[PDB]
Symmetry: C3
Subunit: 556 residues, 3 copies
């Protein structure tokens, strides 16, 4: 009895699942620690009440079950580490990529990949019917409408963190939670539902909910997703330092539109320092309104009368994101008044950026080899009146057809770099207002060029140019300078030259027949023209006083 | 007695505060673990001696008290997790922002926000008297000079880490510590003092001290701050992966000048991969010398005779920082020989960057919609002789008045992008030395332009241009090229044209009266001029031998 | 007996090394936790069998020994925290940098730094003989061929994480492991071998192996290195969020060539969000093939017949890296089909980038003050046919000699910024295809310039220019525009002017003697020329029909 007093004071309290027949029995006994030291088969909907206790739950075995294992009434500060969820069912999965990591787009080829596995692919859903046209008819019935996920559901808790979670056909759901985090996810392999979900459709708007660190793979739908969360002006929530691989839908998704009877939208969240690779749909989908066939209202949210479709003041903090390998769109969003910075998107089959934004600013964007399968009309689309300050376009891929590279018809852009085809740029205004003294350095040509193109006149032909051309060969120390203008849709049709053939003179073009009065523009100027009937040059002169006179300029 | 032997060997040692009347009694009993499992009211200055033991302190309740709870004599490798500090006093706080997140600047409006709360605002300090002019007179006495903070003080320890700390009116102070870290701060809400402080005014210069991860909110002064730390050439200290929200002063601060009798300055620290949002003063304040009314000496530091004011070899490693929403300056520093990269600052009421630097290099800087309240003279200021390589300016905001955008009178700059008003650029030298072949693409105009502006001549008017203008309408296949020069402060006053009205000729300007001898510049050139008394063009000719002759060029 | 039942259920299981004579005895007794609470002297090769148990190993003391302490048969999910390795031997180390952090390059100066210490320098190896020419002869024998490292070796384990490791002369080796991580390394000071190594020369290719977070210092060779790892298309492995300081070789290394009888190469790894400072050799060395004296084959890898040397499809995910202070190369790699983004390299004595790549894309690269000791031929080298989209060159350093800045003879580049000497650019093609309307703003000169340079003609002289020059002084409201061409290797030798001396006319250069027929280029143009024998200007006219006629243009 003496020792027991001492022992109760000097040892750390932990209960372990191997000592109990059910998880509730263990939860009930727990005071400080709880060790999961044996695999536990749960039934879908099995619910554990943790009594408001602040528990440190250390997992060293699996939770095995189809459906949801529901944790409730955990005290603020509770932590669950090392959790591993696994389904009982091994479903049919598709694997729409080759052994050289090329995407498969042909429905029949995708069907041929079918296998029963808990990983290395995903269970088809209805969105696959759109993504792979014709697949709905070709999929066997046993591969359609599957619904396998083993989900850890944290329900109506505050201040709970799940650390280093993993699994097979695994999901993690925080339902009606606040100040909860999914930290350092240890590459769970996903199932039918989203891998990591913060859903706050009921109760107060979600706040304080983050994905921090870690990564996921596979899954039928999006890797990380938010419904009805608002981080406040403090931006207390979102996703930082995360990697998503091969989402069956999108890497990171803020939901759009109405779900159930209320809004699924999100405000004031962080999306930073993260990477999405090889999503079947999109890298980041940060829109809040439905694009195609939209609702006429926003129950639970701002009405259309206050903010039109795609013009919500979403106010997310969006910075330093990387997307590679999307089969859909690399980076998509909507909203009004947005600031977005430092986005890098490479090698996507659909548009690199699809931006249904207005009065927003995009700084230091790089869109490098996207729309490679011509799925969309362009590589970067912007609908509304926005500003782009720094835009890198084109890597090493060519474009065979007529699609635009940037179509941002209401936007003002500066700072494009890359080997863009200028005919594939469409913006409201493009300008470099603040360059210093300039040099055009030409490699691999016998000339250097400074060209001008007026898109209203022609998007495909330069309207004038300033050239420098070698006279003779390399090392001659001689070039000629040429000032040109387009005529009859023939670039460089008319030109003045300086030093052609090292002659040290200006070659001046003249009107090839009698110049009309209106040909001359300015006072105190002359326009030479040809009088064939005398073999003479004449000059149409607009005198300093504005009156016209015709003079003889050169004679036989 | 048999079991007790076995039990002492097989169980983890931890003591818990619920078994002791004081925190010292628990600390004294501890061997391995210490669990804080009941709220503990401490008195200011209460000091716990941990006996040099390497303890793992796990907090699941609050430390409650105004003033400092002082931890001493923790062994290297000790860890304190989940600590939650809370004041006993609920002070008066101000909230100088609206329900639409607009800053309040009017003192009377700020006073009207007063409430008693431990969060959602901050206790006024003397710096508020400057920030909100007139507020000193308008604040009620009960809202002035408050001093509420509940501070965990780690004193004279080596190798101690505080993880996942939080609180209300909370602070964390490492005094005279080395190799200590504040890791994954769980959004403590601050009090009167700095939220996270590494202060090494006594003893050896601080080294090995970091803030890694996490975030803070509110507080009256700066969120994270350093005094008398030097990371060594190894750069072993600083701040990485951190977020500061709504600092009452600045997000991240390295102190300047003398504090007490010695230097508060800092060297060789990292500031990387971090974000500061909505500080009342500055985002990052990385200066070491006092700007306004400076000391004539640096006791404990390099003398002015060795390094002039603002020219210390601070040698911080500064990269990948984001600031949004400052009411003061987004990014400020001083020093000589600095390299700074990848800084992004958006939507600040004062200057985006205030750089009292010399012989320093700034690479890939973006300053986007700053000085929005005209608090400073410019958006980015640089005092000394520096280099800027890549500078994005202007988002979507206009500027109504005469303030400069960049004033860097001793600096050489290249790579500006954005819709900057060129009259608002002031630098020593601006150049694009290494561009390739160029094309100017014009949208929304009937012409394209390549303009030249000599700032010594005029900062507001272009001095010459190369234009291409549509002849007729869209699709004509015809344009004219125009080479212009300014005269009488009228841009484009004098010009030569090629292909005006699709005439296929050059329109050449001539001197409107008798040309003086000195009007012609080069040998083997001619200058046409008007002789009104005969209705003739003449030519002032400088012959190949340099001598002048006047010839008749065109006659009736 | 009643209490013992209760106690066995309610307390956390942990054994502690203080209760056992050997580490194996403790490992054998362990069930859940294992506490290292006394220093433990191990013998090189001492091997601990952990029985497949999933153990949480908490270290609060040192493992002391030269050689390897080998951990085997740890269960998936095992974690080792706070480990501290220390050698028994204090070796001789060199410190090739000064008290102002300047690199020492002179062998005799390096030898003079010799001291016996476990840190603050490194043990020489054979690579130092190359790095510091002559040092092999000058080093005393007792400083050559040393081999001191205290290494924690995790052998043939899956799912083991080492967290917050540190030490003196310390190394960490994961041999034949999968799904293992080195997390938040707490600045171990290195020994003779690599600090952190994932080596998978035997068994399956390594996968799931990461360095996440943390930092290292010193060491004789590379800080973090990989052999025979392949992350799969999922990119499940690599290095994220890491800092390396003063590697004796390189910060981060993927091995090249054959080691033993098989490939040491690596595929599909992440290298992101990391920093390397002051390596003696390279920052990042991400090559897979041997550059100098290469193997004729790749046992265990793709044959040369399939992929030529330096053209392996390495497919690493490489983004957001910073290198400063290398004595060798900042960033090096090889491979074909690579995408690389957001690399920043500053202040390196050798090349900033050495890129033996083909059909690869580099986006937003900044190479700022590199090759400062002229160790290589250039600041950035690219061998193969690649694309660079955004390249910042030049900080504040000058270059005295003739070395190139970029030599990328097969690459197409766009978006250079900085005060580059254009004669030091060599590329296949350089272009800005997508600029908007342009303005050249000139500061500190009486003129503004838009220059053209044809590198085939001359890399050192501009071939033509468009200038604007002040007439009179500041505020005159007058400038002249000038269009020039090079002749006899004299820039600006021949020119046309508009508004010289505010004359409002064009000054036109003429051929200084009788123009040859071939001097005129285009039909409907004239070329003025001088007839000295009559003091007349003539015109060589190519009529609209293409035939030549000579006319009198101006007469006495
Ligand atoms: Ca004549």
């Amino acid at each position: 009895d003496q020792y027991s007093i001492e022992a109760d004071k000097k040892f750390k309290y932990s209960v372990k699942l191997s000592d109990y027949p059910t998880l509730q029995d263990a939860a009930s006994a727990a005071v400080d620690g709880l060790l999961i030291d044996r695999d536990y088969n749960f039934y879908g909907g099995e619910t554990v009440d943790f009594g408001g206790k602040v528990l440190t739950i250390e997992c060293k075995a699996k939770f095995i079950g189809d459906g949801n294992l529901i944790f409730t009434k955990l005290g603020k500060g509770s932590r669950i580490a090392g959790v591993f969820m696994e389904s009982t069912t091994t479903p049919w999965v598709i694997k729409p990529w080759t052994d050289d990591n090329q995407w498969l787009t042909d429905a029949a080829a995708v069907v041929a990949t079918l296998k029963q596995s808990k990983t290395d692919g995903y269970q088809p859903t209805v969105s696959d019917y759109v993504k792979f046209p014709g697949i709905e008819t070709l999929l066997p019935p046993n591969a359609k409408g599957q619904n396998i996920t083993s989900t850890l559901e944290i329900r109506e808790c505050i201040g709970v963190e799940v650390h280093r979670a993993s699994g097979l056909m695994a999901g993690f759901l925080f339902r009606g939670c606040h100040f909860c985090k999914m930290v350092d996810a240890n590459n769970p392999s996903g199932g039918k539902d989203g891998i990591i979900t913060f859903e706050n459709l009921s109760g107060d708007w979600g706040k304080g909910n983050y994905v921090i660190g870690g990564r996921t793979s596979y899954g039928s739908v999006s890797s990380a997703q938010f419904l009805r969360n608002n981080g406040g002006f403090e931006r207390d929530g979102g996703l930082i330092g995360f990697t998503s691989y091969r989402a069956g839908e999108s890497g990171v998704k803020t939901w759009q539109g109405t779900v159930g009877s209320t809004t699924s939208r999100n405000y004031n969240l962080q999306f930073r320092d993260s990477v999405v690779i090889y999503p079947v749909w999109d890298g980041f989908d940060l829109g809040a309104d439905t694009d195609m066939n939209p609702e006429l209202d926003r129950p639970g949210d701002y009405p259309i009368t206050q903010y039109p479709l795609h013009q919500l003041p979403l106010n997310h903090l969006i910075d330093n994101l990387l997307v590679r390998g999307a089969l859909g769109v690399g980076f998509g969003m909507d909203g009004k008044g947005m600031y977005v910075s430092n986005i890098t998107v490479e090698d996507c089959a659909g548009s690199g950026a699809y931006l249904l934004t207005h009065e927003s600013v995009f700084t230091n964007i790089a869109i490098i080899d996207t729309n490679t399968k011509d799925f969309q009309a362009n590589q970067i689309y912007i609908s509304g009146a926005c500003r782009v300050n720094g835009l890198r376009l084109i890597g090493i891929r060519s474009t065979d057809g007529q699609s635009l590279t940037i179509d941002a018809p209401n936007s003002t852009v500066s700072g494009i770099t890359g080997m863009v085809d200028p005919s594939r740029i469409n913006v409201a205004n493009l300008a470099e207002e603040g360059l210093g003294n300039i040099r055009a350095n030409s490699f691999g040509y016998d000339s250097a060029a400074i060209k001008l193109r007026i898109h209203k006149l022609s998007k495909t032909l330069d309207s004038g140019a300033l050239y420098s051309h070698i006279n003779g060969g390399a090392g001659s120390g001689s070039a000629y300078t040429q000032l040109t203008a387009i005529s009859g849709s023939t670039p460089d049709a008319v030109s003045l030259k300086v030093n052609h053939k090292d002659c040290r003179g200006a070659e001046i073009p003249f009107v090839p027949d009698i110049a009309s009065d209106d040909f001359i523009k300015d006072s105190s100027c002359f326009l030479p023209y040809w009088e064939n009937n005398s073999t003479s040059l004449k000059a149409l002169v607009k005198k300093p006083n504005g009156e016209l006179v015709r003079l003889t300029l050169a004679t036989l």
